[PDB]
């Protein structure tokens, strides 16, 4: 019955969705003019990624106030506007919640940093170097190199998973929790109905800071005990009893660490934590598991093994808490360029990919732009802005030699999170309608070919099989609440499964590949007769056998 079991989520990207006022900057007037075009679609809820002051280190996630937007976004007054046109079109708000960590140049850092007696010093986690002058431990950063950087000013090292311009939040500090709980009533007072929490896994540090265990391929190390803290749970639960139980809201932890039994932890309603997380396991299936090249250590797709992730997701929260279901936002590729066919058969395989997921049990999740089929783009190295990218280079290629220039172009080519940051392609003429002056990084060039006016012209657009989506998700019930079953699950091209719920089934039958491919139905399912509610080709209705084409997706409904 909750409104966040039955929405479609629409993720905006803000400095890359609309720029209203010409600096090649997506803004959030931007955002007002462009919600007809999300409400239209169908999704009834927008996540906004972050536009609070930052310097934009991580383009956002590096925030320096908390009360304040970014000026290349606009004012608060243009925030309030947003969220009043939200509200007057029936949808939902939800803000990018970023509170393992803030910028350098937040107030509290930049006073932090002065001196052991400041009264932010324990906002932030400050150690003393070992005897020999190194860092307190071997933790690595996310975006490279080490976890610590040093100050000459007092003689510490302060922590920062991500980059050194986002040092992490000292949780143990109470002071920090109540900065924390009073900027999410600050917002949700002013009508922001829920929050995406960025990198929550990692909010509570294990405090004694151990060494990682180690034989011997690196130097700084990414491990278990950057999530899942002790006290994580402790926190979302003081978070919930504090501010999320005040409010009538939705929450959505990137659950960095996660795997199901924590999922359960996050989000079973009677821990009173939050509603839902983010996994990354169906998004890590393509990593070599532990390579000192991290994500770059690229696997070829493998649909068994994403159907076997996705399926112990969807079996481990199937009568307990509730699962997201996504393939692309900003930190992924576009899904068809990553694992399908972006060229002849792009069409199918966009409409492929969406079907199984919004098949699924869960909250759907649509980034901008995956509504249209966008892709990876052919752009030089140089061009990437991401600083992922540009730190991973000088570790992997240049310093420590694990990758070759030639392997790590094609790594980037494929994963790079600028392939989901280049401008939304809403028309073909200049710059693909995101802005009348210079866009922050080039719009892909395959924009001419790909874009919303081409896809609202076409009855056979992508952007018409994800509103007929997200239509069938409001008028079948059984979308939103049925349990799930794997079907002939040892297929290596043929992704099928089964909802049933108050004695209706939905057969959801999909070949993610370019090869023909065959369902048979099991045995229990050969005497249903089904109406087809969607395919991404001309169809009929027996859909006990059915000889499938290339990326050729079925759903169909038992009568
Ligand atoms: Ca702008």
């Known amino acids: 019955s909750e409104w966040w079991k039955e929405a479609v989520v629409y993720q905006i990207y803000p400095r890359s969705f609309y720029d209203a006022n010409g600096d090649g900057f997506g803004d ?41 937007m970014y000026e290349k976004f606009g004012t608060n007054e243009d925030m309030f506007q947003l969220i009043d046109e939200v509200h007057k079109r029936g949808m939902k708000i939800v803000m990018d919640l970023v509170v393992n960590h803030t910028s350098d140049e937040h107030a509290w850092f930049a006073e932090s940093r002065k001196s052991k007696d400041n009264p932010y010093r324990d906002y932030y986690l400050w150690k003393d170097p070992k005897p020999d002058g190194s860092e307190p431990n071997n933790w690595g950063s996310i975006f490279s190199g080490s976890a610590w950087t040093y100050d000459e000013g ?18 143990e500090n109470e002071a920090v929790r109540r900065e924390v709980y009073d900027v999410m009533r600050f917002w949700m007072d002013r009508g922001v ?19 990682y265990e180690t034989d011997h391929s690196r130097s700084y190390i990414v491990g278990r005990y950057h999530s899942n803290g002790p006290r994580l749970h402790e926190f979302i639960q003081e978070m919930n009893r504090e501010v999320l139980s005040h409010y009538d809201c939705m929450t959505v932890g990137e659950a960095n660490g996660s795997d199901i039994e924590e999922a359960k932890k996050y989000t079973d309603a009677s821990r009173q934590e939050l509603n839902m997380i983010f996994t990354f396991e169906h998004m890590d299936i393509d990593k070599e598991q532990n390579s000192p090249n991290g994500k770059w250590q690229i696997k070829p797709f493998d649909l068994i093994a994403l159907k076997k992730t996705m399926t112990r997701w969807q079996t481990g929260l199937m009568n307990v808490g509730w699962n997201t279901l996504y393939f ?71 310093e420590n030699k694990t990758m070759s220039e030639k392997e790590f172009v094609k790594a980037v080519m494929i994963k790079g999170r600028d392939h989901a940051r280049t401008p939304m392609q809403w028309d073909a003429g200049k710059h693909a309608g995101f802005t009348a002056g210079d866009p922050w990084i080039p719009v892909n060039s395959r924009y001419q070919d790909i874009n919303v006016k081409e896809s609202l012209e076409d009855q056979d657009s992508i952007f018409f099989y994800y509103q007929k989506l997200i239509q069938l998700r409001k008028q079948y019930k059984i979308m939103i609440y049925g349990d799930y079953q794997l079907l002939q699950e040892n297929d290596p091209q043929v992704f099928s499964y089964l909802r049933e719920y108050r004695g209706e089934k939905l057969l959801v039958v999909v070949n993610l590949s370019e090869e023909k491919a065959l369902f048979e139905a099991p045995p229990e399912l050969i005497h249903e007769r089904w109406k087809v509610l969607i395919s991404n080709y001309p169809e009929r209705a027996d859909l006990k056998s059915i000889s499938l084409k290339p990326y050729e997706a079925v759903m169909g409904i038992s009568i």
């Open 28 to 68: 959030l007037q931007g955002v007002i003019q462009k919600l007809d075009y999300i409400k239209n679609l169908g999704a009834d809820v927008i996540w906004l990624s972050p536009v609070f002051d930052s310097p934009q280190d991580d383009n956002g996630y590096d925030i320096s106030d908390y009360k304040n």
């Open 193 to 211: 109905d829920g929050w995406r929490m960025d990198a929550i896994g990692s909010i509570s540090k294990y405090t004694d800071f151990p060494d």
């Open 154 to 171: 007092t003689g510490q090292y302060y922590l920062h998973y991500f980059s050194k311009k986002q040092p992490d939040l000292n949780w």
């Open 328 to 398: 692309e936002n900003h930190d992924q590729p576009r899904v068809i360029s990553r694992w399908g066919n972006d060229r002849k058969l792009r069409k199918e395989c966009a409409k492929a990919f969406a079907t199984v997921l919004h098949g699924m049990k869960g909250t759907p999740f649509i980034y901008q732009g995956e509504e249209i089929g966008m892709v990876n783009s052919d752009m030089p190295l140089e061009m990437y802005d991401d600083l992922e990218i540009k730190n991973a280079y000088r570790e992997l290629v240049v």
